[PDB]
Design a protein around this ligand. Structure first.
Ligand code: FAD
Ligand code: FAD
Ligand code: FAD
Ligand code: FAD
Ligand code: UFP
Ligand code: UFP
Ligand code: UFP
Ligand code: UFP
Lengths: 215, 216, 220, 216
């Protein structure tokens, strides 16, 4: 399961442990204890704020996104990450170039297409400088500091359903930067596919964002 | 995989995400070569690069005495869900030390006596507990008379990194003998599911003193 | 500040880092700003609270000294985003101190025997249990084993260091009617101390983020 | 309060502190139902805790730092999850013209084609070009959050960092080390200096029995 994001990014499901019943199983071991009663249990937990059971469902995603997006994403501390190193490996000539539509709703002094060019220009100059420095003998960890924030990076993300729902509340929301919103929509999609009951209950009683209830 | 512990407890594997290769894929950030992948696991462990192992996750079902659970629950980097003494009626299941548990201490009374002394207050406490309930006393208040050796059950979801920290601390002679027994069981299961990580752990990071002397 | 809880327990403030302004300074770095005036700053706290910007409050930290029954501590210790250090039954000779519910504790439930009867039967188990505990020790039984006969109402002690964000989550969950009465009582004391040290944050918390019920009916 | 300048335009500034060495002693002492004692026994306890890996007591010592560092350094720093952060926003505020320009010495031990002076020149140039484009887009009507994506990783950012002594020591083990990038090493050294100043005993014990790095 893979979903393309932005111009060169993506979100792909690597692994998953459990499903909706994993939360039911965990929670049930509380009352010292059926598709109908179990699904209702999930609604009950979601409705009353008992989310610890959902921590027993875990996902591992492989993500490709611009650094400025990853910086916001990595602020979510209740999760595990492993990302490509700009000091250990040579960075690929891959940058996020906003589409003209990105600026829609904004009256700019110059046509959107021009903005696209300006950004692509800097990217090109920075990357060339980067390559020159390396070939010149400068260590990679130093050379890459001239590279712009829209440079793509990749990382593995392991997170449980509870932290994932917090992520969606904050990132699958109009207040979050559009770019990460797009990734969050992808995460939600995959989450829905693997845990329909939990996702359904989440949207109905806990989800605090706005966009998931309109897309 | 279900292993009996003490007189009435157990450790059961409920689920697991990944295997040794999960740590390898995460470290490389990719997606093949047994020799190279195994080498990487050792490399990561030897140099303290522990984060890749967080991508391996386990869910256990555990039955243990509350005094053991209290120590176990001090490990904050994990998820727990346990039976409630205020929501359900507690079963008559208590941990009675084996006659050999005190074999090594200068005791004045015979092992059978200790067993009888413990079994005695246990029976009295539970009887009192049931009495209060039947009398209308809320469960949450009635259970306060129950001894710390009462058995409880919980689900534990933890990643390999935090699990290794648990083994360093609990699979060790300094920890209470009772939790050591559980830690040995967790270690066996870990070893079965992640042989490479487990071996590299014992070889380069394990800080305890029993897993190196004991088998699996 | 040392508030008595239940019959022998307590909550005491050991230390604190920062105050309402600590959260303001933290939040301001976002817009490349610092403090302003007490009017604008207090407005920010309220603003942060109502919009779900919780991280700034993580910069306010408290350390409490708590004495409570083990069954209460077990619930308390489930809050993982905090630090704890507790008295050890493996390393220390536990003293004779147990939580004996007051007669009023059962007020509201139609029981068979008198509230005073429940009291005596609880104290009975306690005495017999502690009795056996000392005997086992006197007999050479190591403390870590001897204590397993002790009941859950035995009092324990611990230090608790937690930041304002986690503390608010604690209050949402424990200063609430769904939590056991015993820990509710402790949560009220935590709230009282919180209110005194961070009045702006506290007030903003009750009006905008607090999800519990009792703090809106009870004072401080 | 303390402030140490790092790199060409950065700094590490102590904002607040909760507790001191004795805070760890008090927290630890509760285990034996005890409290503070003399200076000789208390300091000895700290070394004891450190030696045997009993680290929880140190979690009761907390610091709040105010840091100004380039983004590439901050990204590594923010990987330390057991802490609290609040940082300057590129989508909410106009970013200032401050970039980390390596000094000629930075390339020490590295023989490069073009003179180090030239490396400095080239870095400043791309930096200048990117920033001007940034302002151009901003005055052009482009949202701050979009315009800033052309800015390089050596752009200076600012943030508040609240961390307890236990996590701080893990930070030093990893960042106050030759394996970590030189730039963050410099920040780590300033962090250690402040730590030492505020918690002499803890720091001394840490360096003698727990510190895993190689530059302190
Ligand atoms: C619209 C928007 C604007 C933002 N603007 C800024 C900004 O200007 N500056 C900035 O620095 N950040 C900003 N952020 C990032 C924000 O401050 C959080 O870091 C981010 O949302 C990650 O959330 P989290 O802390 O809830 O999650 P996680 O770090 O993944 O934590 C999940 C849960 O565990 C918790 N938790 C984890 N660790 C701790 C701890 N140490 N103490 C107490 N509770 C803890 C909380 O209950 C939390 O919700 C913004 C986010 C959004 C969505
Ligand atoms: C032999 C033995 C004796 C003990 N005696 C006592 C006693 O007398 N009193 C007592 O209260 N406890 C005692 N403990 C419990 C001990 O203090 C820890 O709570 C327990 O080992 C759990 O370990 P942990 O903190 O490493 O693990 P986890 O809580 O699972 O944490 C794992 C890792 O994340 C970290 N971490 C998590 N949270 C934080 C945080 N908030 N700040 C900084 N780092 C963090 C550290 O790197 C840690 O190793 C004892 C344990 C053992 C094994
Ligand atoms: C009325 C009531 C009834 C309860 N009944 C039961 C029961 O029957 N069985 C039982 O076992 N427990 C029960 N509990 C305990 C409950 O499951 C939680 O452990 C307790 O409320 C502590 O809350 P917390 O997880 O939100 O807080 P903390 O552990 O302090 O965590 C604070 C925040 O960080 C988060 N967080 C921390 N760690 C993780 C993680 N690993 N993954 C994802 N997010 C994380 C979340 O955003 C969280 O709210 C009950 C609690 C209450 C108040
Ligand atoms: C020389 C060097 C090279 C590096 N190279 C890379 C690289 O190529 N790619 C990359 O992505 N990162 C890299 N890193 C970052 C590294 O992977 C860690 O993210 C960083 O050191 C932060 O450390 P930490 O996890 O120990 O600390 P914190 O996140 O602050 O955690 C402190 C303690 O709590 C723990 N803990 C916290 N959360 C969890 C959890 N969810 N599960 C289990 N235990 C937990 C552990 O005991 C840990 O030591 C590198 C770091 C160094 C020093
Ligand atoms: O929407 C946001 N999301 C986020 O996670 N940050 C955190 C990410 C980074 O650590 C710092 C600066 O972010 P940015 O420049 O994207 O605003 O604050 C800020 C925002 F505005
Ligand atoms: O070996 C131990 N393991 C442990 O986790 N504690 C923590 C558990 C509990 O929160 C408190 C007291 O534990 P105990 O009475 O078992 O010593 O400290 C203490 C020990 F001695
Ligand atoms: O109100 C509660 N609060 C709580 O923290 N638990 C957690 C505490 C313990 O780990 C386990 C059983 O608790 P208890 O017997 O008190 O119900 O679940 C349970 C409740 F019902
Ligand atoms: O020394 C390092 N420290 C660090 O924290 N990372 C993490 C930071 C970032 O999230 C990603 C890429 O870092 P960098 O490009 O600096 O190598 O991995 C990587 C290193 F090599």
């Amino acid at each position: 399961m893979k979903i393309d994001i932005l111009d060169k990014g993506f979100v792909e499901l690597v692994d998953v442990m459990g499903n909706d019943l994993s939360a039911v199983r965990a929670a049930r071991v509380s009352f010292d204890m059926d598709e109908e009663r179990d699904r209702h249990l999930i609604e009950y937990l979601m409705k009353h704020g008992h989310e610890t059971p959902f921590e027993h469902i875990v996902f591992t995603f492989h993500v490709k996104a611009p650094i400025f997006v990853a910086r916001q994403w990595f602020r979510h501390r209740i999760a595990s990450y492993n990302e490509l190193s700009g000091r250990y490996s040579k960075l690929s000539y891959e940058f996020y170039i906003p589409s003209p539509e990105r600026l829609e709703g904004y009256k700019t002094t110059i046509p959107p297409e021009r903005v696209t060019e300006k950004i692509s220009e800097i990217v090109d100059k920075a990357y060339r400088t980067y390559l020159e420095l390396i070939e010149s003998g400068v260590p990679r960890e130093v050379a890459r500091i001239v590279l712009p924030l829209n440079l793509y990076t990749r990382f593995f993300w392991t997170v449980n359903a509870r932290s994932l729902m917090n992520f969606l509340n904050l990132r699958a929301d109009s207040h979050a930067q559009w770019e990460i919103q797009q990734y969050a929509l992808a995460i939600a999609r995959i989450f829905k596919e693997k845990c329909p009951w939990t996702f359904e209950a989440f949207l109905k009683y806990a989800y605090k964002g706005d966009i998931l209830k309109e897309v």
